[PDB]
């Protein structure tokens, strides 16, 4: 595998401060299996997300499950079996800031990871044991499938 993180997320709010943009919506989500809160921008024109939807979000280091990190360039035209065939939405971006929780003065374990998908931001916040394998200046694939 080349998976960093994987969990099922439930959408809890769609626009906290109003609809600032047409195509983009700021999804605030919470995970069942782990206590992870998720901020995520998605293009809601190509992929529409509703306030009750439940989706599976995998973050992966490589899009080919055989664990070959060979990415000189990404060719859209090329067709081979990959991980994206199982998922509806895919984004490519870079982890750019790992930051500690400020809200407790002692004995804390929550971490924030920030990923930017060309300006579509993600904050993934949770226990340090679940965010393992994130490093600054690393490039990750988000993958996302809605569940019935």
């Amino acid at each position: 595998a080349g998976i960093l993180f994987e969990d099922i997320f439930d959408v809890k709010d769609i626009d906290p401060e109003g609809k600032k943009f047409d195509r983009v919506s700021r999804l605030h989500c919470e995970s069942e299996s782990f206590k992870m809160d998720l901020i995520l921008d998605v293009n809601i024109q190509i992929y529409p997300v509703d306030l009750g939807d439940k989706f599976r979000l995998v973050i992966a280091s490589t899009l080919y499950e055989d664990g070959t990190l060979d990415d000189g360039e990404y060719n859209p035209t090329d067709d081979r079996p990959s991980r994206a065939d199982q998922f509806e939405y895919v984004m490519y971006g870079k982890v750019y800031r790992i930051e500690g929780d400020e809200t407790s003065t002692e004995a804390a374990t929550r971490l924030s990871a920030y990923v930017s998908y060309g300006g579509l931001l993600m904050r993934l916040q949770g226990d340090a044991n679940n965010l393992h394998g994130f490093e600054v200046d690393s490039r990750v694939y988000l993958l996302m499938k809605k569940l019935a």
Partner: protein, 99 residues
């Protein structure tokens, strides 16, 4: 960090700086050093590098190579910021108040 900073700052080329600037760097590096302690106390990081969830070392990371490049960049930017001999410094003063 403090030990490695004072090893670089005692090299001969740093002696050409004004002492006020060398104090400001040491004051800044001491400030940076205290943030590392506060984070490592909060998260239970051990300075020997042994702690298992390795992502904790990203929080206030600083490496010897980065400290060396930092001190050279500061010292260079100070020397190149001095008012060069020959500068018609009265004419710049005159126009900067006139405009």
């Amino acid at each position: 960090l403090i030990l490695t900073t004072e090893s670089i700052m005692k090299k001969s080329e740093f002696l050409c700086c004004q002492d006020s600037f060398l104090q400001e760097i040491k004051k800044f590096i001491k400030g940076v050093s205290e943030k590392i302690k506060k984070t490592r106390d909060k998260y239970g990081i051990n300075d020997n590098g042994t702690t298992e969830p390795r992502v904790l070392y990203q929080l206030d990371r600083i490496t010897p190579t980065q400290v060396e490049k930092f001190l050279e960049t500061c010292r260079d930017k100070y020397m190149r910021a001095q008012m060069e001999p020959g500068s018609a410094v009265g004419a710049l003063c005159a126009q900067s108040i006139g405009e």
